Design a protein around this motif. Structure first.
Motif, short mmCIF file in Angstrom:
data_model
loop_
_atom_site.label_atom_id
_atom_site.label_comp_id
_atom_site.label_asym_id
_atom_site.label_seq_id
_atom_site.Cartn_x
_atom_site.Cartn_y
_atom_site.Cartn_z
N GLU A 2 53.56 104.71 126.90
CA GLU A 2 52.11 104.68 126.76
C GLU A 2 51.38 104.16 127.98
O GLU A 2 50.15 104.17 128.04
N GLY A 3 52.14 103.70 128.97
CA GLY A 3 51.52 103.21 130.18
C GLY A 3 52.37 102.14 130.83
O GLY A 3 53.43 101.78 130.31
N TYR A 4 51.90 101.64 131.97
CA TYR A 4 52.63 100.60 132.69
C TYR A 4 51.67 99.81 133.54
O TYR A 4 50.51 100.19 133.71
N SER A 5 52.16 98.70 134.09
CA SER A 5 51.35 97.88 134.97
C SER A 5 52.16 97.35 136.15
O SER A 5 53.38 97.24 136.09
N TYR B 241 46.76 97.83 135.07
CA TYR B 241 47.29 98.75 134.08
C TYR B 241 47.02 100.20 134.47
O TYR B 241 45.97 100.53 135.03
N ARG B 242 48.01 101.05 134.21
CA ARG B 242 47.92 102.48 134.50
C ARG B 242 48.14 103.16 133.17
O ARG B 242 49.22 103.04 132.57
N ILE B 243 47.11 103.84 132.68
CA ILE B 243 47.16 104.52 131.39
C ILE B 243 46.79 106.00 131.48
O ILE B 243 45.98 106.41 132.32
N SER C 217 46.60 108.00 126.28
CA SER C 217 47.38 106.82 125.91
C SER C 217 46.75 106.10 124.72
O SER C 217 45.53 106.15 124.52
N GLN D 182 46.70 99.30 127.34
CA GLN D 182 46.11 98.44 128.36
C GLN D 182 46.42 96.96 128.16
O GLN D 182 46.92 96.29 129.07
N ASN E 159 42.91 102.43 137.28
CA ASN E 159 43.68 102.40 136.04
C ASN E 159 43.99 103.75 135.40
O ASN E 159 45.01 103.90 134.74
N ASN E 160 43.07 104.69 135.54
CA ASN E 160 43.22 105.99 134.90
C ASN E 160 44.12 107.02 135.54
O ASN E 160 43.77 107.62 136.56
N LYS F 116 50.16 112.05 128.85
CA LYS F 116 51.48 111.42 128.92
C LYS F 116 52.69 112.34 128.76
O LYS F 116 53.83 111.89 128.84
#
Length: 262
Positions: free
Chosen positions: A71-74, A83-85, A89, A94, A109-110, A115
């Motif tokens: 769902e994402g990562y940071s 955060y990268r979403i 996501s 976030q 972030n975006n 995904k």
């Protein structure tokens, strides 16, 4: 939550990492033909964090336990959790990768795509052309860590490649023993393992394969008729497989299913 030191990894530590991740996301009671399966989407905790580490820093991945979705990562950008979403996501991704973060997402972030593999490939190219392994993963990690995300030319391309390699080495390898072993076989090679038609087939049929296995009432070994359109490593049709081959060489973690034989 689990951590995988990519930079210092060996095929052994990679396998150990996958075992640990599977244990963190598996159903505590349910089994199927001796194989473990993913838990529900309703059982807490919702996510399992996967810290991918290298010399310069750590990437924190938010993996949804029930479906193993990324769902994402940071990472760290300008001294702060970034955060990268994805555009689709889960809304809580976030605050999962950056605990307590209530900021409004911006260009840093975006991630400019969904995904899915189609989304990631829109910027990273066909994944069949990207090698999976310690070298390729570590390379992409260094290329994007703490870097200005607004650079479409290099960053977005490199990030998509990072995501394509990471999701397959983390989620797909946890699901499929087949992929785990192919990656291990080319672990330290610069080229890595480029996913063959069988790996691709498995990735596109996690639930369907799990379900044909679940429907088999026979205990011990038997011939399992697979879902349609799967291919083998030589791009030929792969239409049946024995339960033993599925348990021993193919599946490492099934989807959440009701299964007659334990």
């Amino acid at each position: 939550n689990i951590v995988f030191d990519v930079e210092n990894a060996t095929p052994e530590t990679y396998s150990n990492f996958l075992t640990s991740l599977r244990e963190a996301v598996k159903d505590k009671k349910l089994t199927c033909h001796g194989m473990i399966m993913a838990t529900t989407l309703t059982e807490q905790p919702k996510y399992v964090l996967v810290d991918l580490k290298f010399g310069s820093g750590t990437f924190t991945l938010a993996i949804r336990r029930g479906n193993l979705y990324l769902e994402g990562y940071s990472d760290i950008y300008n001294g702060k959790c970034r955060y990268r979403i994805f555009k689709d996501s889960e809304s809580d991704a976030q605050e999962t990768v950056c605990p307590g973060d209530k900021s409004k997402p911006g260009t840093q972030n975006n991630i400019p795509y969904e995904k899915s593999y189609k989304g990631m490939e829109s910027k990273g190219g066909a994944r069949t052309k990207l090698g999976l392994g310690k070298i390729t993963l570590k390379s992409r990690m260094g290329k994007i860590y703490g870097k200005d995300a607004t650079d479409q030319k290099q960053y977005q391309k490199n990030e998509a490649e990072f995501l394509l390699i990471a999701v397959q080495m983390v989620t797909e390898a946890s699901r499929f023993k087949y992929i785990e072993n192919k990656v291990k076989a080319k672990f330290d090679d610069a080229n890595g393992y480029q996913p063959d038609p069988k790996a691709i087939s498995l990735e596109k049929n996690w639930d369907s394969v799990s379900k044909v296995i679940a429907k088999v009432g026979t205990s011990g070994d038997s011939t399992v008729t697979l879902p349609g359109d799967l291919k083998d490593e030589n791009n030929k049709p792969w239409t049946t497989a024995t339960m033993n081959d599925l348990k021993n060489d193919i599946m490492a973690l099934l989807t959440h299913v009701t299964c007659k034989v334990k």
